[model samples]
Target: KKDTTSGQKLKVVATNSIIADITKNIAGDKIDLHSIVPIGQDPHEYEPLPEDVKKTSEADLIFYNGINLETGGNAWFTKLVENAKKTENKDYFAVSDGVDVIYLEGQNEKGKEDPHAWLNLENGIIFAKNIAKQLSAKDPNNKEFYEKNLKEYTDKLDKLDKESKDKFNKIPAEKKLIVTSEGAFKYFSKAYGVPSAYIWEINTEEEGTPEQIKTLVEKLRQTKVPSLFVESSVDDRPMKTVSQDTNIPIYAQIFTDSIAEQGKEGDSYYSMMKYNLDKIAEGLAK
Candidate 1:
């Protein structure tokens, strides 16, 4: 409450880079937005630093991905807010609120809801709407600006959904299965009608064990999967080993959980997603 009377920008803190990206898009330069996790980092395993806690104390509003996407869930977030000195610092919101969540039943794992809802354009639009609504409530004077930005962003999302479907349709239906390191693409698969398999449940928990890798290899051997994929967030060593064992071609990376490093070709969320789509199509076409 820095007297916003001066018409100074609102300070916003986002839990992850992707959320930060959307917040920046809607708020433009009107809000001071900061993301806790940088690009190419996995939020599932990220540990907050002293500076992060200090920043959290000063934010006018905090945006969290909730639904257990953060390394620590609501409990952890609540604790951080509680520890902050000011009551206003405790005021935080989850962007995933009001959006339908898809539960993922992974190999040797349970009780995990798919935290990668942003992978689907439909869900991404919902996320943007929720952000706009929350921000409007905080700053009524800026409601029109936020609403206008939301509409424009939603239109882009609609186009993205249509274009992604068109691209998926171009790939033969029989070659739709996508194997990867973790089950982070269920929403994407469901949205595009592409079947998928991964080596692990969530990255926070244990990754693909030797037994799991063997199991995946056996499945690929039986079904004759054309290629295996990796992601920028996780190492490709395991995937490469899987391909070697199955003698399958190791294909492109998937931008499931996070984006790439800054200045990298796939640094932006949209580019990484489209890059993955093209790569998947290429692998299948071959």
Candidate 2:
């Protein structure tokens, strides 16, 4: 007898690798998941190829990070759905819909909401729940399986959340600051009770401008932050300049905007978060 489940997997597409990783955790073997942006690519500046559109057309459902995270913000995802003729909320959805978004201040995009909500484990739990809910609705036969997976995944998220809080709490009060090239860690900083300073608000816009660099350099000098960090997707030269100007060493690279490539330290969502926290601890504990 032929195995009936062999060809019964739902085809799912996520906008970024991080989202795809989380969806994979919930859907497991029940779905064929693919991420639009390649590993190590910045989603904010990613140019969708013809293949991306074709994949969207073929997907049973698509999930994307909402709240203006994409190239042209929320409009890009809306256009993608419209072009693919996928019904919103039924055939496609934004994982960030329910999470409360954080808005940045005093940057190029001041007052604009930050879209990196998954940086916080609690919001990540929300992401998993939303994925499970949609997947269960799409594939009712495996609803129980999806719900079970959601439970396990959320438990892991809760553990990560607690561990992160404890780890960040260990840092000295004066050192609880994260200085980086892109201001993409608002959610993470808020979650861990740390504040961040960066050269730019969003990566899609001009990065490391003279004014931005000067501003960040002044902040670093004033705060005397122990170390500065660069994101995986953005050039580190600006941060290097800031490091030189402020006499602060550039610490380990932090995973933001995208995950590390395969066989790398931050290849998965959980591993990426752990790696980030470890680096933060090492950098700030000095």
Candidate 3:
């Protein structure tokens, strides 16, 4: 092991952009950071590249969203770390370690846990704290720095959660139904008291299949949700088909799974979450 003697920053790697964004919040510029999964790419099925292997090799700490992400529970992370020869709980940690995990609901998809836990503020706070804990543990010299940033960053989550709930509370309970193309909002719905209906449970092909679309189409009519939502990470065609069948329109293309391109509304974790809530209120309150 090389001595961290000459003021060398901790070298870090995050498996996805969202985790990278959270890591940036906690670690600040104290660490050199690289995220393996590019923005807009599906983390569950990402292909590791030569550059990614090289980065992991040099990393002192690595963070990944556990629970089947980064390779459908098969654990692409294990292979990466094993190949890089990094020890678990030493060289890397799952940011999702402590937070309660939600298992997939569908019969076919059951037994697998959802990997989108960061979307919910409560879980997001847990994620941030975990990062702070890990970072501080790994770099005891910079403990104060990481916690200071963690406090400031998580305080924003507290405020955002309050604001989101207040606005969503104003919408009639019946109208607060959230319809989307994927069942990615269970945690968000649980936290904010909104009901979610989506075409499918997790990411895969044939997204806009007749059966999934038909199921959502009927649910839209039953709930009469003011508008449907499509995520930046998935095609809008499936949701659009649901919209067409139900005569309801898509209210927005919101951020899901990952942050948006730079300088966009959904570029930051907080902004994207706030945008999702703002658009949800606008569409559902009417």
Candidate 4:
């Protein structure tokens, strides 16, 4: 379904900034995209307000990173849309379509799916492809444009994957352990040859206990790792304490559950990944 609006571009809304970035890359100037959760905001803890519902209700197409990535769950948006349909509005779509999800084993008590598949570049390619296809279907007049954009974007993702692999390969196999604030890096670590250890295995869990802190600190010391890493959403207190206690340097902040703040140099997926990879490669090289 296509409609010619008075605006110069197609009005679109994405559930999160990462999806917005991918949509922008494919739709380019052809679509006006607004991400509900701005960069540097935690999606899991994000609560949509009345204004957010207004924006979503007005869009031509809504994009969300599905598989239970939305912190409070997707029901809110679904219910809002159900009510919004009283008047003609954009259709909602989950871009995590067709990608294999990693369930958090015991943590998903409700049998929810892992929502961090974008941590892996291979899956990022899938996200870009799916976004392009969806946008093309929504606006058939721009099908060829989106297809071309998707191909170029996919190639770039391939290069990113290869670069990450090469960088991860530099670390000696024994030193490939990544200790971070949370277990969000599982997909990245698995794909890049490094295994990550974190205070929190799943995002929905409670804060790290003192014993868990001591235990991780002991592992850091025993392993003789050069540094420790932290996640974007959580407090850095635990990491800082571990660093001081163990005397190891604190590595860069890793992006997991959210995007960067606007104008901070890393508001997009490519920038965020590159930023994290640089830090990871630098730390591992030491």
Q: Write model 4 residue lDDT over 88-146, tens digit each, in one string.
A: 22377777777767777566553477678898888888889878877877788788899
lDDT of each: 0.76, 0.83, 0.82, 0.76
Model 3 off-target regions past 4 Å?
1-7, 106-111, 204-206
TM-score to true structure, per model: 0.89, 0.92, 0.92, 0.88
**Residue 98, model 3: Cα distance from true site in angstroms:** 1.5
Candidate 4 accuracy as lDDT = 0.76
lDDT of 2: 0.83
**Winning model by lDDT:** 2
Clash totals for all candidate models: 0, 0, 0, 2
Model 4 weakest 10-residue run by lDDT: 81-90
lDDT of 1 by residue, 177-219 (tens): 8888987888888888888988886786667689878888888
Give per-residue CA lDDT, model 2, range 69-131, as digits (tens).
Answer: 874554566677789999878888889878987775643452367888988989889988899
- When 1 and 4 are scored with TM-score, the better candidate is 1
Task: Give the Å error, residue 17, model 3.
Answer: 1.1
TM-score of 2: 0.92
